[PDB]
């Protein structure tokens, strides 16, 4: 569903399977984080369900030794001098040596200013050790981290739990239609996007001969050329688009190893899983109460948050003792306004909109013969209708989806393809729709702040700054301090600084906070891009200094003051809010938990073979399960009749089912529940298990 999910599906470590241990077999000792995991396996990226601690992901710098042992590199230090020699050590090898801090006060010669430096010893103990005693030091920060969890800015400020959660939702982002690069990110994004494989990389340098939406032909330096066939609207394994747009020009020379066309969640060759949105951390009339979020309808209008969803439907035309199944239009008893968008070959015309219940592929099948009702025999003489000896086993578009039609991939034995035995024709139709943002869709940042969309309210009804720019998103303040995810407001401040730009006035000497701050950072342009490594990043003082210099956009207006808050006017009442509220830009991504795929309702569907209970799941008609714990609450209220109906006539009793249906079509009073059939089936199993079981009237 995004390049990140593909990346983390590989380079991940599981504990289940043949020869491994199951969830019930897994004790509390396995799920922990052993101190030996440092640098080998990341202690963040982990599923949060029942598989917590079993399935993990490899670190960014880790390597597999030839024997199967996980091996990591580390710098070696001698007499307070760190060489550039990079050695690779296994887990047990680190016991004999002493590894040092990833971020240590190096003096450009290897010596550390103070002797005692925080180092990790053999048995996982972290103690101070004189500089002359340590022999190894870490390659770099973010060595004990994974690729997915290396994209979270201000990681060191977030709690382990929220960082874990955010790393988890990183894999669940969906590809938008624009995929804007984040304003604030980490340097890992570019490498991850390049190595994901779905961003085409010019293998050999040279100038570009010609560029087009469907193909690109690069003119190499030596005679021959190379053409890169592009993939457009390719269906993914999770029903997400895989658009691939080129980002080169007609005659600009390219270099081997350069990005050529962006992937589903990439722009300019770096990761882009979401968008940059204005943020208000204030509570708003309880529509954002308890982790809810309210978005602006501008995102609906501007298509800021919208994702294409490609759906594939299959139909099999096999061989049967009825003869064969023909893909034609001769479907019995059909109208015209439903058949208008279906071609004369038995399929939909390319580019015809359909919704639930519409006919998709006409697979006529010989009906056979059963008890033809006498009423049918009478009926055929009133309108002249023919027998229609074939059952209309066509394709009905299931409930809760619609959209346009992409294309037809038709296979047939007449086409001389390797179809399965007995199968004569295989037709796969593709349906796509543009899913707008709506209430119930799950949104989340990169710090683990989740939540559904409480309300999509118009642009007038939002706080707006003195510039008149409406806010984009609103988050609840209660969720920040109670969840230890303070990093999100830091990211918000940095995002606002990047959006506005700054010019540190280093005229009368460099400011003290900016002294350690590197060059080319004291000056910045509006809507610039900055990066922040997870553990070696911008400090608090640097952020304060950036907030101090916040040059305005077009007029003279410093909307965000030094402390970080800003003044907002209510869009409903119009009076200014009595206190300033912090504003900024935070990265927000759509999650693959849309409300459309999670809405389900059932009046009367199918039932299982053994017991007459309904089925389960959205694939069939489903029907909610009423577990025995809910029955306990049923009993606690004492609502005996409701429980009786639920367990007898809404679930089990066949005669009760048909009778109650007849009752609420005839407007008649609902009759008494009968004897459940599942109880009789249990009775029969007991009777057939050589247990004499008999129910006694008196």
């Amino acid at each position: 569903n995004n390049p990140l999910s593909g990346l983390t599906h590989k380079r991940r470590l599981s504990a289940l399977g043949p020869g491994g241990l199951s969830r019930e077999r897994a004790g509390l000792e396995v799920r922990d984080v052993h101190p030996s995991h440092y640098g080998r396996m990341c202690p963040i990226e982990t599923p949060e369900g029942p598989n917590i601690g079993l399935i993990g992901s490899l670190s960014v710098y880790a390597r597999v030794n030839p024997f199967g042992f996980i091996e990591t590199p580390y710098r070696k230090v001698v007499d307070g001098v760190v060489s550039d020699e990079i050695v690779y050590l296994t887990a047990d090898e680190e016991d004999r040596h002493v590894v040092a801090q990833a971020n240590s006060p190096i003096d450009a010669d290897g010596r550390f200013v103070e002797p005692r430096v925080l180092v990790r010893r053999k048995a996982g103990e972290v103690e101070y050790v004189p500089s002359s005693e340590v022999d190894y030091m870490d390659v770099s920060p973010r060595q004990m981290v994974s690729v997915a969890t290396a994209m979270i800015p201000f990681l060191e400020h977030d709690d382990a739990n929220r960082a874990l959660m955010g790393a988890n939702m990183q894999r669940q982002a969906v590809p938008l239609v624009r995929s804007e690069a984040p304003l604030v990110g980490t340097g890992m994004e570019l490498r991850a996007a390049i190595d994901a494989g779905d961003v085409v990389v010019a293998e050999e340098s040279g100038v570009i001969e010609e560029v087009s939406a469907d193909y690109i032909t690069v003119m190499h330096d030596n005679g021959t050329r190379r053409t890169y066939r592009m993939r457009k609207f390719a269906r993914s394994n999770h029903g997400t688009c895989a658009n691939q747009c080129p980002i080169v020009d007609a005659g600009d020379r390219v270099e081997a190893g350069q990005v050529i066309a962006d992937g589903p969640c990439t722009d300019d060759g770096e990761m882009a899983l979401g968008k940059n949105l204005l943020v208000a951390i204030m509570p708003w009339e309880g529509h954002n109460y308890e982790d809810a979020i309210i978005l602006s309808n501008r995102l609906v209008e501007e298509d800021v948050l919208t994702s294409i969803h490609i759906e594939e439907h299959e139909i099999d035309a096999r061989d049967t003792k009825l003869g064969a199944e023909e893909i034609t239009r001769d479907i019995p008893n059909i109208s015209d306004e439903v058949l208008a968008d279906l071609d004369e070959r038995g399929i939909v015309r390319i580019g015809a909109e359909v919704r639930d219940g519409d006919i998709l592929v006409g697979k006529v099948t010989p009906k056979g013969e059963t008890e033809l009702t006498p009423e049918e025999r009478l009926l055929r003489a009133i309108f002249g209708e023919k027998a229609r000896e074939v059952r209309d086993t066509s394709l009905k578009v299931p409930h809760g989806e619609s959209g346009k039609v992409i294309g037809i991939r038709v296979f047939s034995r007449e086409d001389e393809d390797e179809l399965p035995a007995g199968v004569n024709e295989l037709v796969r139709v593709y349906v796509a729709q543009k899913r707008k943002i709506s209430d119930g869709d799950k949104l989340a940042g990169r710090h683990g702040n989740k939540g559904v969309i409480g309300k999509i309210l118009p642009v007038e009804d939002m706080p707006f700054l003195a510039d008149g720019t409406p806010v984009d998103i609103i988050l609840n303040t209660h969720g920040v301090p109670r969840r230890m995810n303070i990093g999100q407001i830091l990211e918000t401040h940095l995002g606002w600084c990047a959006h506005s730009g700054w010019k540190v006035d280093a005229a009368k000497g460099v400011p003290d906070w900016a002294a350690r701050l590197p060059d080319e950072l004291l000056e910045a342009q509006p809507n610039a891009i900055v990066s922040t490594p997870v553990f070696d990043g911008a400090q608090e003082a640097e952020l304060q200094g950036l907030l101090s210099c916040t040059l305005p956009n077009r007029d003279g207006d410093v909307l965000v003051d030094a402390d970080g808050k800003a003044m907002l006017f209510d869009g409903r009442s119009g009076e200014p809010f009595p206190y300033p509220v912090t504003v900024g830009y935070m990265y927000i991504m759509k999650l693959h938990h849309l409300v459309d795929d999670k809405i389900h309702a059932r009046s009367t569907g199918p039932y299982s073979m053994i017991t007459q209970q309904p089925l389960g799941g959205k694939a069939q008609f489903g029907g909610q399960r009423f577990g025995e714990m809910e029955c306990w609450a049923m009993q606690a209220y004492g609502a005996a009749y409701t429980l009786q109906e639920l367990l007898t006539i809404k679930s089990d009793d066949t005669v009760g089912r048909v009778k109650v249906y007849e009752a609420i079509v005839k407007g008649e009073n609902i009759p008494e529940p009968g004897i459940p059939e599942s109880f009789k089936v249990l009775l029969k199993e007991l009777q057939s298990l050589c247990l004499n079981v008999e129910v006694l009237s008196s």
Binding site: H34, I52, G357, G440, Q539, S603, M629, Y641, E645, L646
Partner: protein
Amino acid sequence: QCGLPKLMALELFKPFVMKRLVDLNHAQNIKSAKRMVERQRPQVWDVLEEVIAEHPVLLNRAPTLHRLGIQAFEPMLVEGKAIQLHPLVCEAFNADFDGDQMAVHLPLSAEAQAEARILMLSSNNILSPASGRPLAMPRLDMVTGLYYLTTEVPGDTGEYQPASGDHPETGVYSSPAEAIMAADRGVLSVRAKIKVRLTQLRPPVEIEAELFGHSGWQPGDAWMAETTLGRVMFNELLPLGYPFVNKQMHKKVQAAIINDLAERYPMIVVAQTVDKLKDAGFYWATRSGVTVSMADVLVPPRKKEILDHYEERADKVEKQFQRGALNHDERNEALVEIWKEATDEVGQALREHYPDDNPIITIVDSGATGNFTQTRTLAGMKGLVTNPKGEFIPRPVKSSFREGLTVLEYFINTHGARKGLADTALRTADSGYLTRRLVDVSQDVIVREHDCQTERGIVVELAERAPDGTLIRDPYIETSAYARTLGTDAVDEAGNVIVERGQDLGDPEIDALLAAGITQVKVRSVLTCATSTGVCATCYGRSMATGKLVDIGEAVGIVAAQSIGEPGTQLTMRTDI
């Protein structure tokens, strides 16, 4: 009320709308009504809205811990595909908007609809059946709003100050209407101490007795109140007969207020007033100006000195450990004690440094969410980081999440975080198993008859006397002595009968008992009920869910087993008992 997606309702009420639409001649025949509804032609929507009127529906969220896990609502059609859940019953379902889903069940029979309308209506079950405390309390946001509304900041704008010689007090307002008129302009702030002549609000008991006399009926008679008009608006929410409060609004104070309201007011009145409280709290949470930022998260200036002092103590104990006089066990224990004292000192310093009006501060003391330990973890220094085995690392963390962490500090913190998150998943399953066993063992305990007339009963300590001479109220009374029935008569020094046998033993009764000086009483409990099957109603006593005497058929066993088993997810061990 509760929301319901239009498509969801359309599919749920299928035969109902068929019969209704055919009755309205929408489709001559039901076979036509099939395609009539499945094509979702516009004429189905109004005929659907007709049939939802006063047809209750059930809402459920898995898992169902207590009896309040299933509630009945009267739904309205709402556009979209999400269930609009009222923000007050989130506590009952333990429901949060992270993306959690809820199942909806449609009652069918007339009996079932009646039960949904009476027993399971969300308004009719406010009190928690477990302990009797109000479970539909205002939650985080509205608590913050009310706390901001009813707080009284001195030195505010438009305050009342006595004066003479040149100008009057200029702080007294004729009516709350004029008060809000002034507050519309900038002359007077909401949280300023003023004096207002009130008419529609009952004055407190002492003032009423002092001035109004025996006939203390409020709406007719005017009286002068010394308070802030924000408290006036807050009092306006409560019913007419409720006395004025004029107190700051923490969670516990609203808990007491709503408990009293449920005690001495009809159920519909409290169901309406809690809704009014929710509206006011949500409205005033926005203007409360509670917002988190780097400025609001302050660090203690004294942190460096305290940290260096305890670091020097740690260095001394480490040098002692090197000499070998104390074993490694003594080293770890001394380090743990020193660092625990250090983090306590840091916490108290942070408490003294933070202003009382800081956003995090007003959040934490209002009781909406969080604890001061979490604030200390945010700004300052976390404390002691645990080990996968369960021990405390001798070298603890020193910075805070606001100052950032280094890699190995994050590693050691991850140790404990993963440990806790793995333990939670096992403990919830264990609690589920315990609930199952309790429900099975206590299934047959159901009230059968009103009273067994037995005299056997248990005794509750009930505020044992102190050596100095007083009646020190027992800390544990509401769980032990409240909502009971007296097995005998409460008589002091063989004198007057303070409370006769067979009494609800409410708060006035317990106050009378304490005033009389009595300590020991006999309680008619279930442990001595003489009924052959089940328990007599009098033995069980007052039912917390209703606030009255338990009914004659309520399944007390299931309700009990659920109440014991519900908080199983909040159980945590200490650091071989």
